[PDB]
Design a protein around this nucleic acid. Structure first.
Ligand SMILES: [K+]
Ligand SMILES: [K+]
Ligand SMILES: [K+]
Ligand SMILES: [K+]
Ligand SMILES: [K+]
Ligand SMILES: [K+]
Ligand SMILES: [Mg+2]
Ligand SMILES: [Mg+2]
Ligand SMILES: [Mg+2]
Ligand SMILES: [Mg+2]
Ligand SMILES: [Mg+2]
Ligand SMILES: [Mg+2]
Ligand SMILES: [Mg+2]
Ligand SMILES: [Mg+2]
Ligand SMILES: [Mg+2]
Ligand SMILES: [Mg+2]
Ligand SMILES: [Mg+2]
Ligand SMILES: [Mg+2]
Ligand SMILES: [Mg+2]
Ligand SMILES: [Mg+2]
Ligand SMILES: [Mg+2]
Ligand SMILES: [Mg+2]
Ligand SMILES: [Mg+2]
Ligand SMILES: [Mg+2]
Ligand SMILES: [Mg+2]
Ligand SMILES: [Mg+2]
Ligand SMILES: [Mg+2]
Ligand SMILES: [Mg+2]
Ligand SMILES: [Mg+2]
Ligand SMILES: [Mg+2]
Ligand SMILES: [Mg+2]
Ligand SMILES: [Zn+2]
Lengths: 184, 131, 52
RNA sequence: GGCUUGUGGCAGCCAAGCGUUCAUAGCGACGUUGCUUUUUGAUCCUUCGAUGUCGGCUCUUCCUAUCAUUGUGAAGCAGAAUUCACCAAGUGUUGGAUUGUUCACCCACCAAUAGGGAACGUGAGCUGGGUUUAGACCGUCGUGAGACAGGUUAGUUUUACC
RNA sequence: UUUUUGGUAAGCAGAACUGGCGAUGCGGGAUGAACCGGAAGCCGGGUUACGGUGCCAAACUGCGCGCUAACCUAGAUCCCACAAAGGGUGUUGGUCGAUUAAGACAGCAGC
């Protein structure tokens, strides 16, 4: 059962310069510029004027599922260049304090003393992502950037770098976890 | 600190060495060597400082027909010191200990190799001359 | 000792999970089917056991 | 070797119950569905103008239904140890007493001492302890000659240059 | 093929009716005594049977509709060279019932 036409629309803010050509969307705002390649989607992107219209013709239920995904990605780009994204992480430990060392212009972090281990864990932030230790809150990291995927993925790298092993993780709750998914 | 370097192995299984302590045993019959992972057809062998499992073939009846650990203190097979000198003793000897390396006896007859003394402080305490 | 707020955050990742009875995969608490292909996307799920 | 798989071995489904509580952490009664050809049978298709018939030794390669080693999930996983499961055959899997043994059993070491295939791998590669010619002894059986998937001891292992 | 006895079963053993092989090539089934087609003097032309028409390889990458996506070597043609119970919020059809503009469902809000 292929529906003849499935379409969804979104409103482009007033202070955003959106450029679309051959499923190559470029969004420019006060914070910077973001671009995503949507050539892998068999959809029809159109700017009508400002609004963005995405249509799928004679697409199966799987094909039409990408319509909302495309709009959400475009919406994230608009929010990235307007408000930005801010992910907050909290150190969790029972006995050994977790020591963090920001270096390289807030583009890198080193974790020491995780569960008393002498190994040093080094994580490099992705492009456009900066990590800063919060001062208002105790043992809190703040990651900021424009691309949600890069900021969120940077937080995931830190979280997975500090997994406890050979222990009951239910009791050994040590680690660095994302506590807030917000925007600047 | 550091660990002991490899030495020439001169005492394979079935080797019978003199007992250098005063426990009453007169010889030790090697049946296995600790730490040997082995190779097909390869007899386990021990050197000075190695702990081995042995039986007393001649001595007090209380010590015979029993398996006990022992440490080699002298060997006749020459081995190379790091300074390039090859050393060897006039005979093969060992002392009966417990699994923790504590001597069963209280005195040692004759000299003992320096390699064995470093690994086993209890044996070195009861030694006369450490060469 | 861990703060009650922080340990609640930690258990969101290590405790609040569903376990597949066929492949033991860790699934989100609201999971109804396992995402693994080896078990055939089994719907036989159990909560991850807590400490008593 | 081939067909078959009763038997042997390995695996799944249902959930009565066990598990202090609690069907499903770990187990699975009563039933029921399969896989495998490393068991033994069934058959008698190939070979009786002959495919050298036990085991060990030696040597290579292959399999995974994983004993140890690398990375992980689960637990009635505090730690330590252990158990269940996943990807995984890259590397390793030993020294001995007794027995011709295969099998087994014990001592000891080890990270571990997993299981199998290759004409039940491998005798113009060995060995010949056993089995399985002729000598000989015992026991039982037979009137006897002799018989015994009973015991015992001695018994020629050929040829490559195609 | 079918009826049929013994056997867990067997490319096992034994009967019933017919055909076939053996005694027989030829086309198809990659390959095969028995399956499918078909039986034959030596030749030319024409047309077919079974089976085929992406290449191997003679004949369409012919004209149409749908289904499938296999990160297990997806699957691919009588005999025939295998696979089961049991499962999937994979996807596609269908059957029965329930709810909904008097406002359902999800979320949100204070029934
Ligand atoms: K060993
Ligand atoms: K069977
Ligand atoms: K024969
Ligand atoms: K030969
Ligand atoms: K003789
Ligand atoms: K279905
Ligand atoms: Mg532990
Ligand atoms: Mg050997
Ligand atoms: Mg049963
Ligand atoms: Mg012949
Ligand atoms: Mg011959
Ligand atoms: Mg031959
Ligand atoms: Mg496997
Ligand atoms: Mg415990
Ligand atoms: Mg291997
Ligand atoms: Mg012997
Ligand atoms: Mg066999
Ligand atoms: Mg053979
Ligand atoms: Mg040969
Ligand atoms: Mg021969
Ligand atoms: Mg042989
Ligand atoms: Mg003989
Ligand atoms: Mg004879
Ligand atoms: Mg008589
Ligand atoms: Mg004999
Ligand atoms: Mg017959
Ligand atoms: Mg005839
Ligand atoms: Mg065929
Ligand atoms: Mg003609
Ligand atoms: Mg075509
Ligand atoms: Mg089915
Ligand atoms: Zn699963």
């Amino acid at each position: 059962m292929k529906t003849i036409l499935s379409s969804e629309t979104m409103d482009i803010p007033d202070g955003i310069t959106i450029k679309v050509k051959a499923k190559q969307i470029e969004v420019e705002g006060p914070r910077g510029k973001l671009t995503r390649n949507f050539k892998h989607l068999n959809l029809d992107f159109q700017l009508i004027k400002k609004k963005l219209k995405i249509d799928a013709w004679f697409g199966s239920r799987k094909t039409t599922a990408a319509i909302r995904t495309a709009l959400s990605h475009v919406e994230n780009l608009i929010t990235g260049v307007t408000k930005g994204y801010r992910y907050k992480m909290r150190f969790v430990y029972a006995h050994f304090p977790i020591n963090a060392s920001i270096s390289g212009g807030n583009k890198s972090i080193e974790i020491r003393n995780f569960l008393g281990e002498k190994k040093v864990r080094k994580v490099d932030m992705l492009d456009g992502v900066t990590v800063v230790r919060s001062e208002k809150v105790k043992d809190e990291l703040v990651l900021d950037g424009n691309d949600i995927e890069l900021v969120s993925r940077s937080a995931a790298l830190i979280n997975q770098k500090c997994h406890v092993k050979n222990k009951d993780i239910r009791k050994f709750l040590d680690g660095i976890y994302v506590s807030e998914k917000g925007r600047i | 600190a550091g660990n002991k370097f490899r030495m020439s192995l001169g005492l394979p299984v079935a080797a019978t060495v003199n007992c250098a302590d005063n426990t009453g045993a007169k010889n030790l019959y090697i049946i296995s060597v600790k730490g040997i992972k082995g190779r097909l057809n390869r007899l386990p062998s021990a050197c000075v400082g190695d702990m081995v499992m042995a039986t007393v073939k001649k001595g007090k009846p209380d010590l015979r027909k029993k398996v006990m650990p022992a440490v080699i203190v002298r060997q006749r097979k020459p081995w190379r010191r790091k300074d390039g000198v090859f050393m060897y003793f006039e005979d093969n000897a060992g002392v009966i200990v417990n699994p923790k390396g504590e001597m069963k006896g209280s005195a040692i007859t004759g000299p003992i190799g320096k390699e064995c003394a470093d690994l086993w402080p209890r044996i070195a305490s009861a030694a006369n001359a450490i060469v | 000792i861990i703060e009650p707020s922080l340990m609640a955050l930690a258990r969101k990742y290590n405790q609040e999970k569903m376990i597949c009875r066929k492949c033991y995969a860790r699934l989100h608490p609201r999971a109804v089917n396992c995402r693994k292909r080896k078990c055939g996307h089994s719907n036989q799920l159990r909560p991850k056991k807590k400490i008593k």
